[PDB]
Ligand binder design. Structure first.
Ligand SMILES: COc1ccccc1OC1CN(C(=O)c2cc(=O)[nH]c3ccccc23)C1
Ligand SMILES: COc1ccccc1OC1CN(C(=O)c2cc(=O)[nH]c3ccccc23)C1
Lengths: 304, 304
């Protein structure tokens, strides 16, 4: 029993973190096989970030200008290329600690673990979600760029995020490992405002199922609803519309608890309309939306 | 910017997790040097747990009855001993991945990371705190015993917790790595109820400082208070009394924000008396108490 915001064990990813320095800029790189991936803004000065022409800036850089250090040892850079917003630095040594890995591009609502790093050294691990506005609510300071987001399926690490920037509102933007930003964000110091940060309805419902599994049942009511009726309420509360795909995804949690998905929707509808009344659910006074249905099943079953 | 419930990178501890089986019971062990530490209840059947005489049960066990497996490979047990509520299984091979380590006994209010494991394999990592009633609010299922809690200071892992049991209320109890339970708990299936789970005041204040550092400042007010006046309110709200030692510990956060500790106490006093009014602080609708002042400084400075 108990339900925590749990991250994947970070060891497999710690073994991939390196420091990348270009000129006076130092950030993190991800070393997989003989390639080190890092944000292309490592080549920029603070003045360059206002309106950078990455292709032009990159012309002034040679392999020897990219200093890559894995622990206390230097890696030899034998090639470099830009792929979208990431640089790929080919090194002469394959990372001996390279885990089985995939590069995946996640959809909003999906969760992942972040290993926050500074100077190629891991500082902490936390769980977050790709928000519906394509930002993440992370915890990143100066030097954190190049820190990665990932999921683990037994022994395969699926990298889904590389950290690039922080918007003025304190939220974060980054790319997949192909260098494509999530959402409309660009690696420039310009006016970039995030859209509405809607609540991930399917994740809230999964977390309500986790609450029932873990004994918190005060919010269960005598009502039901329809997808259309629920969605009228969801729209009013800036929640994402619930689809039949989401209902199907909640099937296993509905089966485990014996609570029909639409009955849980009616409980969530009442919580939205009436509030919590000073009560808590799984130690939270708000409806938590950064646990997917897969996360709830995983945590409640003990997948290693 | 941003503030997350962050755990330490778990790699150093993943390298220590093994599976320990005695008879039909399987749980986790911690392999450091040539010793594997695990809960002594690995020798019990479910019927034994009602009123176990561990010394008597242990007489029926020999080294060859303790099956220790590190990954897919078996470790040879050449000795065994009971120290309080843990067993120490001496193996013939030192763990090659043994990090620099210490065994520490933490005080209530202190936080640590837990690497939840099943069958010697890590499943997830989360952050928690030793509660003032000596329970932890973890996330543990069948087979999680022997999972450990730790802190990391650069390259030294200070192990502080080993998981032993879950109380009927869904909260957890365990020992330090010397086998002494935190609090009054015993490794028996008997009526053991937890005491008042008071709020760790000094941690709430640290988290309010984190909120100011990260831009959430709506709760700052025009008032101040004294330690004695604040403590009258703290007692009423089941908060731990704030001492001058706690005020001194908050000194660096007070210096960083320019907000005197007693002024922050007055803001916390108003939040307790008036509530949040549907507002949030660092994405929470309740006052968070599982970040110590050291955690706040660490997260806000980027210690690796
Ligand atoms: C002027 O630099 C940029 C401007 C616009 C875009 C990118 C720029 O650079 C990169 C951003 N980054 C950081 O280190 C960083 C990332 C972060 O998430 N939080 C921070 C908090 C405080 C100070 C820095 C950061 C480098
Ligand atoms: C009957 O066993 C005990 C009774 C009293 C005391 C100890 C007993 O054993 C040990 C407890 N433990 C577990 O695996 C466990 C630990 C946990 O934190 N959560 C659980 C949830 C569901 C099922 C089991 C657990 C073994």
């Amino acid at each position: 029993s108990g339900f925590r915001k749990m991250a994947f064990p970070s060891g497999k990813v710690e073994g991939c973190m390196v420091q990348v320095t270009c000129g006076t800029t130092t950030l993190n790189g991800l070393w997989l096989d003989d390639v080190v991936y890092c944000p292309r803004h490592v080549i920029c000065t603070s003045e360059d970030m206002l309106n950078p022409n990455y292709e032009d800036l990159l012309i002034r850089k040679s392999n020897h200008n990219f200093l890559v250090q894995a622990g206390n040892v230097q890696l030899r850079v034998i090639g470099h290329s830009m792929q979208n917003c990431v640089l790929k630095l080919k090194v002469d040594t394959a990372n001996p600690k390279t885990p089985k890995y995939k590069f995946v591009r996640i959809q909003p609502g999906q969760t992942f673990s972040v290993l926050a790093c500074y100077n190629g050294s891991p500082s902490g691990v936390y769980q977050c979600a790709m928000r519906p506005n394509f930002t993440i609510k992370g915890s990143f300071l100066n030097g954190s760029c190049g820190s990665v987001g990932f999921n683990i399926d037994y022994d395969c690490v699926s990298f889904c995020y590389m950290h690039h920037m922080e918007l003025p509102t304190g939220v974060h933007a980054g790319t997949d490992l192909e260098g494509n930003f999530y959402g409309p964000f660009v690696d420039r110091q310009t006016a970039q405002a995030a859209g509405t940060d809607t609540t991930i309805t399917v994740n809230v419902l999964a977390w309500l199922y986790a609450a029932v599994i873990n004994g918190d049942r005060w919010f269960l009511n005598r009502f039901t609803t329809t997808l259309n009726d629920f969605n009228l309420v969801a729209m009013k509360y800036n929640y994402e519309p619930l689809t039949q795909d989401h209902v199907d995804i909640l099937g296993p949690l509905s089966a485990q608890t014996g609570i029909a998905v639409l009955d849980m929707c009616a409980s969530l509808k009442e919580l939205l309309q009436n509030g919590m009344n000073g009560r808590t659910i799984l130690g939270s006074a708000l409806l938590e939306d950064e646990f997917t249905p897969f996360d709830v099943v995983r945590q409640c079953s003990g997948v290693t």
